[PDB]
Design a protein around this ligand. Sequence first.
Ligand code: NA
Length: 202
Amino acid sequence: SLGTLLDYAAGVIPASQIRAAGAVGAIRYVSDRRPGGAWMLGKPIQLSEARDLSGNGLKIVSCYQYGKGSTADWLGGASAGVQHARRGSELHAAAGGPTSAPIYASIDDNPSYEQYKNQIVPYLRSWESVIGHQRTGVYANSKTIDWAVNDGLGSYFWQHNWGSPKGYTHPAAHLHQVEKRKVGGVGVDVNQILKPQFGQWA
Ligand code: NA
Protein backbone atom coordinates (compact mmCIF):
# COMPACT_ATOMS: atom_id res chain seq x y z
CA SER A 1 0.00 0.00 0.00
CA LEU A 2 1.00 3.67 -0.53
CA GLY A 3 0.50 4.34 3.17
CA THR A 4 -1.59 6.40 5.55
CA LEU A 5 -1.57 9.97 6.91
CA LEU A 6 -3.08 11.11 10.23
CA ASP A 7 -5.11 14.38 10.36
CA TYR A 8 -5.67 16.17 13.70
CA ALA A 9 -6.29 19.63 15.21
CA ALA A 10 -6.44 18.97 19.03
CA GLY A 11 -2.66 18.75 19.63
CA VAL A 12 0.88 18.24 18.36
CA ILE A 13 1.92 14.58 18.15
CA PRO A 14 5.65 13.70 18.46
CA ALA A 15 7.13 12.23 15.28
CA SER A 16 7.93 8.89 17.08
CA GLN A 17 4.18 8.36 17.91
CA ILE A 18 3.09 9.00 14.28
CA ARG A 19 5.71 6.37 13.24
CA ALA A 20 4.53 3.96 16.02
CA ALA A 21 0.92 4.30 14.68
CA GLY A 22 2.19 3.11 11.23
CA ALA A 23 1.46 6.38 9.37
CA VAL A 24 4.04 7.88 6.95
CA GLY A 25 3.01 11.45 7.78
CA ALA A 26 0.35 13.92 8.84
CA ILE A 27 -2.20 16.31 7.37
CA ARG A 28 -1.91 19.49 9.43
CA TYR A 29 -3.77 22.78 9.76
CA VAL A 30 -2.66 26.06 8.27
CA SER A 31 -5.59 27.79 10.10
CA ASP A 32 -6.27 29.74 13.32
CA ARG A 33 -8.38 28.57 16.28
CA ARG A 34 -11.84 29.99 16.25
CA PRO A 35 -12.72 32.00 19.50
CA GLY A 36 -13.35 29.52 22.36
CA GLY A 37 -11.44 26.77 20.55
CA ALA A 38 -8.77 26.39 23.31
CA TRP A 39 -8.59 22.58 22.73
CA MET A 40 -7.25 23.22 19.13
CA LEU A 41 -3.55 23.07 20.13
CA GLY A 42 -2.72 21.66 16.64
CA LYS A 43 -3.92 24.88 14.92
CA PRO A 44 -1.82 26.07 13.16
CA ILE A 45 1.14 23.78 12.42
CA GLN A 46 4.26 25.72 13.55
CA LEU A 47 7.89 25.89 12.35
CA SER A 48 9.31 23.63 15.19
CA GLU A 49 6.69 20.87 14.64
CA ALA A 50 7.19 20.91 10.82
CA ARG A 51 11.01 20.62 11.27
CA ASP A 52 10.45 17.72 13.79
CA LEU A 53 8.17 15.82 11.29
CA SER A 54 10.56 16.32 8.29
CA GLY A 55 13.61 15.62 10.48
CA ASN A 56 12.04 12.23 11.31
CA GLY A 57 11.35 11.43 7.60
CA LEU A 58 7.56 11.99 7.82
CA LYS A 59 5.44 13.63 5.08
CA ILE A 60 3.55 16.89 5.75
CA VAL A 61 0.37 17.99 3.93
CA SER A 62 -1.41 21.36 4.48
CA CYS A 63 -5.16 21.67 5.06
CA TYR A 64 -7.30 24.70 5.86
CA GLN A 65 -10.42 24.87 8.06
CA TYR A 66 -11.30 27.83 10.30
CA GLY A 67 -15.11 27.63 10.81
CA LYS A 68 -17.51 24.66 11.14
CA GLY A 69 -21.23 23.90 10.60
CA SER A 70 -23.11 27.18 10.35
CA THR A 71 -19.71 29.02 10.30
CA ALA A 72 -18.30 26.79 7.51
CA ASP A 73 -15.66 28.83 5.63
CA TRP A 74 -17.40 28.46 2.22
CA LEU A 75 -20.70 30.07 3.33
CA GLY A 76 -19.28 33.54 2.51
CA GLY A 77 -18.43 32.56 -1.10
CA ALA A 78 -15.90 34.72 -3.00
CA SER A 79 -14.99 37.26 -0.19
CA ALA A 80 -14.54 34.37 2.31
CA GLY A 81 -12.43 32.41 -0.21
CA VAL A 82 -10.07 35.41 -0.58
CA GLN A 83 -9.69 35.99 3.23
CA HIS A 84 -9.26 32.27 4.07
CA ALA A 85 -6.86 31.55 1.08
CA ARG A 86 -4.67 34.55 2.04
CA ARG A 87 -4.59 33.36 5.67
CA GLY A 88 -3.82 29.72 4.75
CA SER A 89 -1.05 30.82 2.34
CA GLU A 90 0.40 33.01 5.17
CA LEU A 91 0.35 30.23 7.79
CA HIS A 92 1.69 27.57 5.33
CA ALA A 93 4.70 29.88 4.62
CA ALA A 94 5.08 30.70 8.38
CA ALA A 95 5.50 26.96 9.22
CA GLY A 96 8.18 26.72 6.45
CA GLY A 97 5.83 25.21 3.89
CA PRO A 98 7.07 25.51 0.27
CA THR A 99 5.13 27.29 -2.52
CA SER A 100 5.36 24.00 -4.54
CA ALA A 101 2.97 22.41 -1.97
CA PRO A 102 -0.81 22.84 -2.20
CA ILE A 103 -3.35 23.63 0.54
CA TYR A 104 -6.51 21.53 0.90
CA ALA A 105 -9.40 23.97 1.40
CA SER A 106 -12.04 22.21 3.59
CA ILE A 107 -15.67 21.55 2.69
CA ASP A 108 -16.35 19.78 6.03
CA ASP A 109 -20.02 19.41 5.00
CA ASN A 110 -22.59 17.51 2.92
CA PRO A 111 -23.79 20.42 0.72
CA SER A 112 -26.64 20.50 -1.77
CA TYR A 113 -25.88 21.15 -5.49
CA GLU A 114 -27.48 24.65 -4.92
CA GLN A 115 -25.07 25.43 -2.00
CA TYR A 116 -22.21 24.12 -4.16
CA LYS A 117 -23.12 26.36 -7.17
CA ASN A 118 -23.96 29.52 -5.18
CA GLN A 119 -21.28 29.37 -2.47
CA ILE A 120 -18.57 26.64 -2.90
CA VAL A 121 -17.84 27.54 -6.59
CA PRO A 122 -17.04 31.27 -5.80
CA TYR A 123 -15.26 30.13 -2.56
CA LEU A 124 -12.93 27.78 -4.55
CA ARG A 125 -12.46 30.24 -7.51
CA SER A 126 -11.19 32.71 -4.88
CA TRP A 127 -8.72 30.10 -3.50
CA GLU A 128 -7.45 29.70 -7.11
CA SER A 129 -7.21 33.51 -7.62
CA VAL A 130 -5.00 33.72 -4.45
CA ILE A 131 -2.66 30.65 -4.58
CA GLY A 132 -3.40 29.32 -8.10
CA HIS A 133 -5.31 26.34 -9.57
CA GLN A 134 -2.11 24.16 -9.24
CA ARG A 135 -2.00 24.72 -5.40
CA THR A 136 -5.72 24.39 -4.69
CA GLY A 137 -6.73 21.23 -2.86
CA VAL A 138 -10.31 20.27 -1.97
CA TYR A 139 -11.29 18.27 1.17
CA ALA A 140 -14.87 17.13 0.40
CA ASN A 141 -17.27 14.16 -0.13
CA SER A 142 -17.39 12.21 -3.48
CA LYS A 143 -20.33 14.32 -4.88
CA THR A 144 -18.54 17.67 -4.20
CA ILE A 145 -15.30 16.26 -5.71
CA ASP A 146 -17.33 15.22 -8.79
CA TRP A 147 -18.86 18.74 -9.16
CA ALA A 148 -15.42 20.46 -8.61
CA VAL A 149 -13.74 18.12 -11.22
CA ASN A 150 -16.47 18.95 -13.82
CA ASP A 151 -16.02 22.68 -13.16
CA GLY A 152 -12.19 22.29 -13.28
CA LEU A 153 -11.83 23.71 -9.71
CA GLY A 154 -8.99 22.25 -7.62
CA SER A 155 -5.93 20.12 -8.59
CA TYR A 156 -5.83 17.90 -5.41
CA PHE A 157 -8.76 15.99 -3.85
CA TRP A 158 -9.18 14.47 -0.40
CA GLN A 159 -12.39 12.52 0.02
CA HIS A 160 -14.36 12.44 3.29
CA ASN A 161 -17.35 10.14 3.68
CA TRP A 162 -20.07 12.55 4.87
CA GLY A 163 -22.40 12.28 1.87
CA SER A 164 -20.18 9.82 -0.04
CA PRO A 165 -21.91 6.46 -0.96
CA LYS A 166 -20.60 3.65 1.30
CA GLY A 167 -17.51 1.98 -0.24
CA TYR A 168 -17.17 4.44 -3.14
CA THR A 169 -13.82 6.08 -3.84
CA HIS A 170 -13.83 8.95 -6.39
CA PRO A 171 -11.14 8.16 -9.06
CA ALA A 172 -9.92 11.80 -8.85
CA ALA A 173 -9.03 11.46 -5.11
CA HIS A 174 -5.39 11.68 -4.01
CA LEU A 175 -6.40 10.93 -0.37
CA HIS A 176 -9.32 9.11 1.22
CA GLN A 177 -10.40 9.58 4.87
CA VAL A 178 -11.24 6.14 6.13
CA GLU A 179 -11.73 6.43 9.90
CA LYS A 180 -12.91 6.68 17.02
CA ARG A 181 -9.01 6.70 17.43
CA LYS A 182 -6.39 8.53 19.58
CA VAL A 183 -2.58 8.71 19.09
CA GLY A 184 -0.75 9.90 22.21
CA GLY A 185 -4.00 11.18 23.74
CA VAL A 186 -4.78 13.25 20.60
CA GLY A 187 -7.88 12.36 18.52
CA VAL A 188 -6.92 11.53 14.92
CA ASP A 189 -8.47 10.45 11.66
CA VAL A 190 -6.72 7.98 9.33
CA ASN A 191 -6.33 8.76 5.59
CA GLN A 192 -5.33 6.37 2.82
CA ILE A 193 -2.82 7.64 0.25
CA LEU A 194 -4.19 6.83 -3.25
CA LYS A 195 -1.83 8.76 -5.61
CA PRO A 196 2.01 9.08 -5.10
CA GLN A 197 1.93 12.93 -5.52
CA PHE A 198 -0.75 13.87 -2.98
CA GLY A 199 0.38 17.33 -1.82
CA GLN A 200 3.30 16.42 0.47
CA TRP A 201 5.67 19.35 1.19
CA ALA A 202 8.56 17.09 -0.12
NA1 NA B 1 -19.03 37.00 0.88
